Amino acid sequence: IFKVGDTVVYPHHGAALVEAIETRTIKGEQKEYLVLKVAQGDLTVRVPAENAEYVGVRDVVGQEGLDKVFQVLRAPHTEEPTNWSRRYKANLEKLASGDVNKVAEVVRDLWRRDQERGLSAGEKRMLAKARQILVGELALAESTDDAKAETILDEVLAA
Partner DNA sequence: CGCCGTGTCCCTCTCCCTATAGGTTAGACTTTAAGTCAATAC
Minimum separation from the CB atom of position 122 to DNA (A): 3
Strands lying side by side in the sheet with 33-37: 7-9, 15-20, 33-37, 44-48
79 touching DNA, by CB under 7 A: no
Name which of 28 and 118 has its Cβ closer to DNA: 118
- 16-28 burial, b for 16+ CB within 10 Å, e for fewer? bebeeebeeeeee
- 43-70 burial, b for 16+ CB within 10 Å, e for fewer? eebebeeeebeeeebbebbeeebeeebe
Minimum separation from the CB atom of position 119 to DNA (A): 6
Name which of residues 98 to 157 contact DNA (CB under 7 A): 119-123
Q: 142 vs 53, 67, 126, 131, CA distance in Å?
A: 24, 11, 24, 16
Minimum separation from the CB atom of position 108 to DNA (A): 18
84 touching DNA, by CB under 7 A: yes
Name which of 5 and 122 has its Cβ closer to DNA: 122
Binding mask 30-69 for DNA (x = CB under 7 A): ----------------------------------------
| # residues contacting DNA (CB under 7 A) | 6
Contact residues toward DNA (CB under 7 A) are 84, 119-123
